[PDB]
Design a protein around this ligand. Structure first.
Ligand SMILES: [Mg+2]
Ligand SMILES: [Zn+2]
Ligand SMILES: [Zn+2]
Lengths: 386, 378
């Protein structure tokens, strides 16, 4: 076997995740399609009669018919289905990756939109704060046995704020708070995550890094998805990687009496990952007010009715799924983590950064591999090693 | 029976609830009757071992150690205990009622939103809030719980409209056209057992009395201000989270548990009613609306995590965990609180919400100036 070790091109990485995920419910949709078609979800009437063990008792339960009571909400309406056009998106990405150079001038730049972000390791530190905050609102704790699962969350958070070349992520050039990606994979192995589960979360991260980079590097991609709400939602869940994060969270939280097999649990996991992404839009509306009142109508209002339509049906499906005791809370967690997390309060307060207070810095310290930090980042989290 | 005790004074109302509730964990404390004592609670380390049926999976779970991650939160601190002198609070109120008067500001609106001029319009916003709370607790809008939701409205309105206890009991005060007796009769028709109804009724009596005493007796609040742990107990009674909880559990429980009896479940119910009050204050201060505000915030988080941990192992955790922590998601979503931060105004009631609220109005018993409230709900 001639040892060939040239770093995969972005096109070859795209092809790798195609071969792994395969098509979703539309042919030619690999790798950017889920197996579940949310446009086909139905809402069952609630008889109000529930056993003590019913899944409706988990998470946050907001009936569809009650949503007009809340001014930031309203009623629901079925979205139009543009999902069959996903093959045209994949074809376009195939074209773009054939000609794309192996590196870009803007690779590694800050894209958080906040003018005070100038050091990528500082941005990574704020992402670790955010990552642990999500973990806790999902239901997890800060016990040390889940260290590398929480590092994974940080890897999932940072490509939103930093343009990360998928090749530098792959080959070890990019480091999150001093950790290479392979350091994270090796850590998950140490934490006992099964090889099959690691590869699933690994491929989900490959797909996130690729789709995050594509929307920054290919100016045509987002305008292609815009307005096609069913396709845009699918793409947003991929760039958020709520599915990969969920896989490792279930591993950390599961009753010790088996492994998380996508084959068996793909449906509940995809449904729960879609629900949490929709809660972001539902909850962000209150933020500006919590600091800005406006009448929203027309197509803007229609998009919100469609997102609420998807959310309530996702949540009802989770009631009867085997892991409702974990997934209902994951699905609705944004209804309480958005109003509490610095990440979102910072945006409303003039796009500044909240200082990392002493208590938070001490929590974050152990997630930093200082030995592998650049010289210019030697001084990050100064109040943390106290 | 000869019709005796046809009318009740405010003093006899106090004696009635005193005889009904009995003492709490201190002698002579009736009707301040909670047996749970927040000051003595202990937080246990999380083992991390939780079965799928574990109660930690219900509600919102925010570990104490994680709270410094959120700038609007922080660390915790134990509160000082003054609870063992609730008996002197009761003796103080007994003394006041020997000479209690009718207040001059009866009927006035106290909503904090200057645009409120019609008490029945204020009641309609309170009904909006009441269904919003009910939904975030986990409830639905099915018609068989109508009068339980009216009960929530009665519990919400005395903060926004000054209501005398006597006018409340004799039907002079009407909530959206309903007398209090209408609600009691309605709960009977809904199948709530007579013992459950009387419990909810006595909790409402206690709420109306405790909230009235705060305004009528100028010495009561200064007396409580120096006794924070007792002021918390008192605020829980003026919020009537326990009476609302009893009726919510009745609507939400599996019909294989029989009636939800407070004699049976008083411990978990008291814990949950305290959790909800603490969460509400903890969330209102944090997200933007007490000798040391900063210190009290640390004590509220201290109480919150200990109450929630106790709820993990309670028989009705599948209802009470969410009840205890619901404020973490209803405070940022409900018009009631968004209206306050947004210049203390009122958000219009859109046609969709008006149609929900329409059936809750007894239009036949409204005054003339209020005949046409909720116009877009028909
Ligand atoms: Mg750019
Ligand atoms: Zn579709
Ligand atoms: Zn005490």
């Amino acid at each position: 076997t001639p040892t060939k070790m040239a770093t995969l091109t972005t096109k070859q990485m795209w092809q790798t995740i195609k071969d792994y995920f395969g098509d979703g419910f539309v042919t030619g949709s690999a790798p950017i399609s889920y197996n579940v078609h949310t446009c086909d979800m139905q809402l069952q009437p609630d008889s109000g009669i529930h056993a003590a063990s019913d899944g409706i008792h988990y998470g946050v339960q907001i009936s569809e018919d009650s949503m007009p009571l809340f001014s930031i909400m309203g009623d629901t309406a079925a979205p139009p289905c543009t999902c069959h056009r996903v093959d045209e998106i994949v074809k376009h990405i195939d074209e773009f990756l054939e000609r794309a150079p192996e590196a870009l001038p803007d690779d590694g730049a800050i894209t958080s939109g906040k003018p005070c972000d100038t050091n990528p390791d500082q941005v990574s530190l704020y992402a670790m704060r955010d990552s642990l905050s999500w973990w806790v609102h999902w239901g997890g704790n800060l016990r040390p046995e889940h260290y590398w699962k929480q590092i994974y969350i940080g890897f999932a958070a940072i490509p939103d704020d930093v343009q990360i070349s998928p090749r530098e992520f792959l080959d070890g050039t990019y480091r999150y708070l001093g950790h290479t990606w392979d350091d994270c994979l090796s850590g998950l192995e140490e934490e006992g995550v099964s090889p099959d589960e690691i590869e699933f979360a690994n491929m989900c991260m490959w797909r996130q890094m690729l789709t995050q980079w594509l929307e920054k590097a290919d100016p045509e991609l987002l305008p292609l998805l815009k307005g096609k709400i069913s396709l845009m939602l699918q793409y947003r869940v991929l760039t958020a990687n709520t599915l990969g994060c969920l896989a490792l969270f279930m591993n950390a939280t599961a009753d010790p009496k088996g492994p998380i097999h996508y084959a068996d649990s793909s449906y509940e996991m995809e449904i729960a990952s879609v629900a949490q992404c929709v809660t972001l839009d539902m909850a962000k509306e209150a933020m500006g007010i919590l600091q800005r009142t406006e009448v929203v109508a027309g197509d803007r209002a229609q998009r919100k009715r469609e997102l609420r339509w998807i959310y309530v049906r996702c949540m009802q499906i989770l009631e009867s799924q085997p892991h409702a005791h974990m997934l209902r809370r994951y699905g609705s967690a944004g209804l309480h983590y958005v109003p509490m997390m610095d990440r979102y309060l910072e945006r409303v307060s003039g796009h500044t950064r909240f200082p990392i207070r002493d208590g938070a810095a001490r929590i974050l310290e152990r997630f930093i591999n200082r030995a592998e930090l650049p010289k210019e980042s030697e001084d990050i989290n100064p109040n943390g090693r106290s």
